[PDB]
Design a protein around this ligand. Sequence first.
Ligand code: NA
Ligand code: NA
Length: 526
Amino acid sequence: KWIYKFDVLYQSRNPRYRNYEIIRTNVQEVLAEIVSPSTKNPNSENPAVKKRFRGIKNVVSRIISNDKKCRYDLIYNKYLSSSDTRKLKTMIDYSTKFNRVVEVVLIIMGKLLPLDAWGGTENKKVIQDRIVDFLRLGANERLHLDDVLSGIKLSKFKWLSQQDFQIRKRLLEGYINWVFISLVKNIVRAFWYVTESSNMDRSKLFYFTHSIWNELSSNWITKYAKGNLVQVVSPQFTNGKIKLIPKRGGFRVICVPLKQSLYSFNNKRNFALKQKEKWDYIFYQKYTLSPVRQVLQLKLNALRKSDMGHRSSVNSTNEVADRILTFRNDLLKKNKTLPVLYMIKFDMKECYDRLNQNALKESIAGIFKEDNENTTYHVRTLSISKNKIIEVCHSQIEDATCLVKNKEGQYDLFKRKQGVFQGFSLSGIFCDILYSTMVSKEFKFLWEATEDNLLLRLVDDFIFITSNKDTLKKVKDKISSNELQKYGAFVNHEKTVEINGEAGSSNKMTFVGLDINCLTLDVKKD
Ligand code: NA
Ligand code: NA
């Protein structure tokens, strides 16, 4: 509940390890952090505390000296160099193994802290185990200080109610806190870019050396920017910071929205903006962005109970199984026994990147077609007009800007050629509006006499089940053509799978981790 892990993540560097220093503060600055972390004025304490300053200063001075003497360039070459420029199949295989991360961190701690700074031999093992625990923490996990101190013998820290034994405790709390916050965290940020994988669990962190991470990220960005981005030398909250997340062979490109303007982000520490800009973002989120996100979702649900075209969009794996079993029971009413069924699954290539912006605007306009320009809406009450919806959506689509941190620590700007950024507040609902509009227009023949046809959309994955072999031909014709490219939906033809119940080497199909039997329509998990 005291020592956090998230603030070591996503730290990109370009370090020179020859003549490198972990501790950037002097001995007096550290003494303030240990003794009075809140006030940062240790001279105000009563003399029972100040008499311990010399013993604390000498220990810190030895740690600071050991830091200046430590040859981190040699430690990197021996343990982290890995100078083998061949390629690997998965990105997380470029990361340093977790055992090697622990070994590097504990070796540096051994070269920084003398035995008496650890509190003796027995306490050194205890603190080392707690350092490993901190390294095993997930992105949203934390470690409590009293958890660390519960295994520490205070009496062994000779350099330091009677009020003597209460001062020793507080000094131990402040010192141990300084070890984790300022030494252990700075060691991690000095050698690794810490991030989580696209494999959902955030409790599994991966540690990439800054040398290999800068090569992998920059190579991917220059590739990705060619087909998706346009550099802007030019400049409501439409700016974001690019964040790459390793995905099996490549990266997932995420644009984390800036909660400030580009001015407050540029300068390091202008505070006269930060506190007031916070309110500008809150009022935009509460009174502009949320009503837009709600009215868009409400209009979508309104077409989710009026038209079959939008009815075909689902949101979870279990929701697919529920609509399939319902489709099975609907067939067991028209036939009294399951007929021969035909199944096909297909998916779109990079639905968010290839999304056609012009067709998206027509879709958003299409769901506000029965309203006048003066129309107003009320949400849980908050007021917002149809025009304000269109204005917010157009700025999110057309004015989206991302910041890419390149090799030398600079910051270049980019807009999108087509598509929408992942991570923006309306990107998901945008893709839902466009794809539902596409399914409602292009697959209109399915919705006539729907008692023998089933189409389901998990956002970029499609499954189609039918008892009509002719209708299966119409669906195969629609996806094999390029008529869906108008919307930016490019069928991934290599992953299009088709099975049916007449014959064939298989009667099973896995779609979202469900295992579907085209004979019985029984669906189990995979
Ligand atoms: Na120093
Ligand atoms: Na088959």
